């Protein structure tokens, strides 16, 4: 018999908005932790319950150091991160805070509020274009990706004129199935950002990269390679997460037409619906990895120093002790306290930007394209694997 008490992890989704069978199994198994086997045969722990996930994400004994040999890499592609200097996502205190603080001023509530006109312009512009062209369209390449791309590039000071290059590099990295393809995509982006830094040293300019070059880099308070990695992190996260939330939300909303109609009739529901979609779709388990630097006892189970732990926020978000009937999409529920953005010192820096983008995107689609519908059946879509950010390669749509 082939039964194991340490199942292969991660698993791939067969439905965009449902837990893989293996994950539903882990969700139902008692206790905060479960053993899994990673692609390389190493055993790690997964965290599968909501409160335990918050506790462990808050535990400084669980390090985010991706350069540690014992870090729970889930594919050969993940060997691209550990090669070059880490952005603050891969740092622990105190280095984490000193670096994160260099970027936080771009993401304040006041700044995000001030960005609304820009986001609305960008959303409606790419919609103007896609709609004028007429159906059939790929919602991913014509809308879901370029919108957040343009927005984050403005925030960063990355010239949108180079979009074909850096969007392809982003796409290659996210779709990477091996180490060499990931390393090449990373190096391509790194060289591009390196040249941008030199350009800023000659001629100062707007955007976070411009500011970091003029200030911290000029004071030697950040390494050039660290600045590259930081800009890269913000660029890729800025592009890829919102793109996936857009595509998957459209698919999910169209599969729940009663809720989608309700959303259209009462736009005050949009912010709450965005939270529920974030909870339900939980696109970023790829960002729950940790390595124990000391023994941690968790409700009778022992995590040993040197063991990998992955906090699986999609499974945690389906904890029925927190969300009644957790596998039901309910745009009227309180999806508050969800872990789609993590918890603690590494909680998503871009979360409020993401929330603004998704609110504007959903309102715009309901306003401008009320007849939007998929042009192929949901079953024909190709979902990305559990080793990357959740999403679809392409999303064929049509409308009146
Ligand atoms: C759209 C939905 C998004 C989801 C579901 C999401 C998810 C996550 C998660 C789970 C983490 C925690 C990683 C960890 O604990 O190791 C994270 C961190 C982070 N995210 Fe987001 N993200 C989204 C959008 C964005 C956007 C639009 C940006 C803009 C740049 C962004 C930038 C970041 C950064 C810089 C971090 C690292 C924070 C730190 O380590 O201190 N994310 N995100």
CA angle 56/61/66 to nearest 5° reads: 90
Q: Which CATH number describes the domain made up of 1-400?
A: 1.10.630.10
290 is annotated as contributing to ligand binding:
yes
Helix, strand or coil, per DSSP, at residue 374: strand
Residue 357 CA to ligand 1 centre (angstroms): 14
**DSSP letter at 348?**
-
Q: Determine whether the annotation assigns residue 355 to a binding site.
A: no
Ligand 1 centroid – CA 233 distance (Å) = 9
Ligand-binding annotation for 153, yes or no, is no
Query: Packing angle between helix 224-254 and helix 257-265, nearest 10 degrees?
Result: 100
87 Cα nearest atom in ligand 1: 40
Q: Answer yes or no: is the C-beta of 387 below 6 A from any ligand 1 atom.
A: no
- Residue whose tokens read 């976070």: 208
Consult the annotation and say whether 229 binds a ligand: yes
What does each C-alpha distance from 332 to 273, 277, 299, 335, 355 come to in angstroms?
7, 11, 33, 9, 17
C-alpha 103 to ligand 1 mean position (Å): 13
Please indicate if the annotation marks 303 as binding a ligand.
no
Residue among 121, 111, 114 at smallest CA distance from 208: 111
Cis (ω within 30 of 0) for the bond into 136?
yes
The three state secondary structure string of 8-67 is ECCCCCCCCCCCCHHHHHHHHCCCCEEEEECCCCCEEEEECCHHHHHHHHCCCCEECCCC
Question: For residue 138, what are the contacts with CB-CB under 8 A and spacing of at least 6?
Answer: 394, 395, 396, 397
Q: For residue 88, give the ligand 1 atom closest to its CA.
A: 40
Candidate of 348, 355, 384 to mutate for ligand 1, largest count of ligand atoms within 8 Å of Cβ: 348
Query: Distance from CA of residue 326 to its chain's centroid?
Result: 21
Cα distances from 49 to residues 149, 239, 289, 292, 298, in angstroms, run: 33, 29, 15, 18, 12
Yes or no: say if 102 and 212 are a contact pair by the CB < 8 Å rule. Answer: yes
The rounded distance, in Å, linking the Cα atoms of 303 and 82 is 23
Resolution in angstroms, to 1 decimal, for this deposition? 1.6
Q: Locate tokens 């449902």: which residue?
A: 18
| Method by which the model was determined | X-ray
Burial degree of 255 (CB within 10 A; 0-12, 13-18, 19+): middle
For residue 245, the ligand 1 atom closest to its alpha carbon is 1
89 lines ligand 1 (CB under 6 A): yes
Q: Is the CB of 343 under 6 A from ligand 1?
A: no
Quick check: CB of 112 below 6 Å from ligand 1?
no
- Alpha-carbon distance 249 to 75, whole Å? 26
Q: In this structure, is the dihedral angle defined by the CA atoms of residues 79, 100, 152 and 254, taken in order, positive or negative? A: positive
Distance 36 CA to ligand 1 centre (A): 24
Mutate to test the pocket of ligand 1, among 56, 64, 237, 245 (most ligand atoms within 8 A of CB): 237
Give the closest residue (by CA) to ligand 1 atom 39.
Answer: 346
Q: In angstroms, what is the span from residue 237 Cα to ligand 1's centroid?
A: 6
- φ and ψ of 323, to 5 deg: -120, 105
Determine which residue's CA is closest to atom 26 belonging to ligand 1.
350
Pocket test for ligand 1, best of 241, 339, 361 (most atoms within 8 A of CB): 241
């Amino acid at each position: 018999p082939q039964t194991t008490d340490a199942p292969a992890f991660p698993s791939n989704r067969s439905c965009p908005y449902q837990l893989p069978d293996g994950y539903a199994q882990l969700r139902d198994t008692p206790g905060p932790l479960h053993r899994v086997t990673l692609y390389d045969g190493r055993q790690a722990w997964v965290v599968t319950k909501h409160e335990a996930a918050r506790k462990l994400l808050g535990d400084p004994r669980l390090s985010s150091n991706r350069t540690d040999d014992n870090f729970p890499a889930t594919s050969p592609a993940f060997e691209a991160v550990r090669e070059s200097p880490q952005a603050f996502i891969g740092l622990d205190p105190p280095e984490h805070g000193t670096r994160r603080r260099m970027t936080i001023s771009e993401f304040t509530v006041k700044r995000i509020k001030g960005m609304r006109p820009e986001v609305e312009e960008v959303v409606h512009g790419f919609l103007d274009e896609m709609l004028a062209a007429g159906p059939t369209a790929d919602l991913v390449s014509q809308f879901a990706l370029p919108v957040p791309s343009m927005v984050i590039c403005r925030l960063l000071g990355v010239p949108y004129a180079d979009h074909e290059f850096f969007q392809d590099a982003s796409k290659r990295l996210v779709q990477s199935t091996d180490a060499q393809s990931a390393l090449t995509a990373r190096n391509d982006l790194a060289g591009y950002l390196d040249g941008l830094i030199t350009q800023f040293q000659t001629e100062p300019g707007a955007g976070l990269v411009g500011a970091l070059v003029a200030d911290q880099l000029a004071n030697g308070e950040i390494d050039r390679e660290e600045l590259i990695s930081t800009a890269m992190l913000l660029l890729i996260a800025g592009h890829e997460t919102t793109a996936s939330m857009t595509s998957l939300s459209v698919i999910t909303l169209l599969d729940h037409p009663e809720q989608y109609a309700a959303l259209r009739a009462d736009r005050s529901l949009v912010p709450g619906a965005v939270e529920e979609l974030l909870r339900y779709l939980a696109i970023a388990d790829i960002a729950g990895g940790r390595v124990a630097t000391a023994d941690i006892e968790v409700e009778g189970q022992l995590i040993r120093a040197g063991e990998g732990v992955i906090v699986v926020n999609s499974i945690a978000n389906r904890d029925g002790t927190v969300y009644e009937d957790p596998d039901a999409l309910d745009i009227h529920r309180s999806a508050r306290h969800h872990l789609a953005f993590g918890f603690g010192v590494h909680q998503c820096l871009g979360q409020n930007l993401a929330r603004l983008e998704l609110e504007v995107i959903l309102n715009a689609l309901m306003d401008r394209v009320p007849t939007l519908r998929l042009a192929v059946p949901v079953e024909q879509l190709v979902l990305r694997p559990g080793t990357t950010i959740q999403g679809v390669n392409e999303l064929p749509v049509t409308w009146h």
